[PDB]
Write an enzyme that holds these catalytic residues in place. Structure first.
Site, mmCIF file in Angstrom:
data_model
loop_
_atom_site.group_PDB
_atom_site.id
_atom_site.type_symbol
_atom_site.label_atom_id
_atom_site.label_comp_id
_atom_site.label_asym_id
_atom_site.label_seq_id
_atom_site.Cartn_x
_atom_site.Cartn_y
_atom_site.Cartn_z
ATOM 1 N N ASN A 7 27.982 68.939 51.975
ATOM 2 C CA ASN A 7 27.065 69.751 51.174
ATOM 3 C C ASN A 7 26.186 70.584 52.089
ATOM 4 O O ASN A 7 25.413 70.038 52.874
ATOM 5 C CB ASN A 7 26.164 68.870 50.306
ATOM 6 C CG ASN A 7 26.916 68.181 49.186
ATOM 7 O OD1 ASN A 7 27.998 68.611 48.793
ATOM 8 N ND2 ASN A 7 26.338 67.106 48.663
ATOM 9 N N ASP B 277 26.697 54.911 51.041
ATOM 10 C CA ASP B 277 25.699 55.713 50.352
ATOM 11 C C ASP B 277 24.917 54.854 49.362
ATOM 12 O O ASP B 277 25.512 54.067 48.619
ATOM 13 C CB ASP B 277 26.389 56.873 49.628
ATOM 14 C CG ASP B 277 25.442 57.983 49.277
ATOM 15 O OD1 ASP B 277 24.576 57.781 48.390
ATOM 16 O OD2 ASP B 277 25.572 59.066 49.878
ATOM 17 N N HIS C 154 26.382 65.501 57.593
ATOM 18 C CA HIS C 154 27.128 64.300 57.235
ATOM 19 C C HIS C 154 28.315 64.605 56.342
ATOM 20 O O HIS C 154 28.301 65.557 55.549
ATOM 21 C CB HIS C 154 26.231 63.245 56.573
ATOM 22 C CG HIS C 154 25.464 63.746 55.386
ATOM 23 N ND1 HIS C 154 24.321 64.510 55.510
ATOM 24 C CD2 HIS C 154 25.655 63.569 54.057
ATOM 25 C CE1 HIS C 154 23.851 64.793 54.308
ATOM 26 N NE2 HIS C 154 24.640 64.231 53.407
ATOM 27 N N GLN D 220 22.463 70.209 49.256
ATOM 28 C CA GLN D 220 22.049 69.402 50.399
ATOM 29 C C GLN D 220 20.635 68.854 50.225
ATOM 30 O O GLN D 220 19.723 69.585 49.818
ATOM 31 C CB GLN D 220 22.142 70.220 51.687
ATOM 32 C CG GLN D 220 21.751 69.439 52.934
ATOM 33 C CD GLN D 220 22.311 70.042 54.219
ATOM 34 O OE1 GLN D 220 22.698 71.218 54.258
ATOM 35 N NE2 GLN D 220 22.348 69.239 55.281
ATOM 36 N N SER D 221 20.451 67.569 50.527
ATOM 37 C CA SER D 221 19.136 66.950 50.399
ATOM 38 C C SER D 221 18.646 66.311 51.695
ATOM 39 O O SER D 221 17.442 66.199 51.907
ATOM 40 C CB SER D 221 19.112 65.925 49.264
ATOM 41 O OG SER D 221 20.008 64.861 49.499
HETATM 42 N N1 LIG Z 1 18.590 55.581 53.111
HETATM 43 C C1 LIG Z 1 19.822 56.006 52.726
HETATM 44 N N2 LIG Z 1 20.937 55.269 52.932
HETATM 45 C C2 LIG Z 1 22.158 55.692 52.549
HETATM 46 N N3 LIG Z 1 22.387 56.867 51.938
HETATM 47 C C3 LIG Z 1 21.354 57.694 51.676
HETATM 48 C C4 LIG Z 1 19.991 57.310 52.064
HETATM 49 N N4 LIG Z 1 19.174 58.311 51.683
HETATM 50 C C5 LIG Z 1 19.955 59.262 51.107
HETATM 51 N N5 LIG Z 1 21.250 58.893 51.116
HETATM 52 C C6 LIG Z 1 22.368 59.652 50.562
HETATM 53 O O1 LIG Z 1 22.560 60.802 51.356
HETATM 54 C C7 LIG Z 1 23.035 61.897 50.526
HETATM 55 C C8 LIG Z 1 22.164 63.101 50.766
HETATM 56 O O2 LIG Z 1 22.502 64.168 49.887
HETATM 57 P P1 LIG Z 1 23.255 65.457 50.433
HETATM 58 O O3 LIG Z 1 22.502 66.008 51.610
HETATM 59 O O4 LIG Z 1 23.538 66.384 49.278
HETATM 60 O O5 LIG Z 1 24.557 64.877 50.929
HETATM 61 C C9 LIG Z 1 23.037 61.388 49.084
HETATM 62 O O6 LIG Z 1 24.371 61.013 48.703
HETATM 63 C C10 LIG Z 1 22.122 60.160 49.148
HETATM 64 O O7 LIG Z 1 22.372 59.166 48.178
#
Ligand SMILES: Nc1ncnc2c1ncn2[C@@H]1O[C@H](COP(=O)(O)O)[C@@H](O)[C@H]1O
Lengths: 113, 115
Positions: free
Chosen positions: B88, B32, B101, B95-96
């Site tokens: 999440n 991450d 995942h 979730q973002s």
């Molecule tokens: N390019 C990337 N490489 C690795 N991790 C990422 C990248 N973009 C987003 N993330 C991670 O993916 C997760 C997305 O948030 P969430 O959907 O709440 O799990 C967060 O922990 C981010 O830091």
């Protein structure tokens, strides 16, 4: 079912608020809820911790997640939720029987502990 | 496209870089970029699924595979004192990235509640 309090719950020896059951898992509300909705999905097979899960357990573990998402929907968690599996001391694992937490009904925060 | 339109699809197709821990035909594990613990990685399916709430019944083995790969990677990374796995889901989950995942966090004491 194993030698833990979750084993006793599976065997129906002590009460829990059961949400769902099938031939291979059980979902029930956590006795110490950390959110307005907080339940567990656990396998009936005694797997002590995720670190010792065998390859053959793969679909069973996925089954916990599918059951978890179905229960979340039934419990009206339409704004989302968080799923958690704790392993070992650093993970804060409270019972040595694999369990999937599902928490919702409030904004979950970051970091996740 | 194989992998979907999110940034995670681009990672799957090697279009944007990642620090990869494990790869097979079904999934990918990578660190991450905003770690919340000394070790913090993600395990994702190569098949695009937007969120756990829309996963199909026949996605069971794949979802389980994420967990098995997660625990194997954790062992390989020396997380012998334990770790926490997290999914999440949606707004309340925070979730973002809408590509399913599994987070794996370790290398420190995790606290309760988990957010
Ligand atoms: N390019 C990337 N490489 C690795 N991790 C990422 C990248 N973009 C987003 N993330 C991670 O993916 C997760 C997305 O948030 P969430 O959907 O709440 O799990 C967060 O922990 C981010 O830091």
């Amino acid at each position: 079912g194993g030698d833990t309090i979750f084993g006793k719950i599976i065997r129906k020896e002590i009460p829990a608020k059961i949400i769902f059951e099938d031939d291979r898992c059980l979902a029930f509300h956590d006795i110490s809820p950390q959110a307005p909705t907080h339940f567990l999905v656990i396998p009936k097979k005694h797997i002590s911790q995720i670190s010792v899960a065998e390859d053959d357990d793969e679909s069973l573990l996925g089954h916990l997640m599918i059951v978890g998402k179905k229960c979340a929907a039934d419990l009206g968690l339409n704004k989302g939720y968080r799923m958690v599996v704790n392993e070992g001391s650093d993970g804060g694992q409270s019972v040595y029987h694999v369990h999937l937490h599902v928490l919702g009904g409030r904004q979950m925060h970051w970091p996740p502990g």
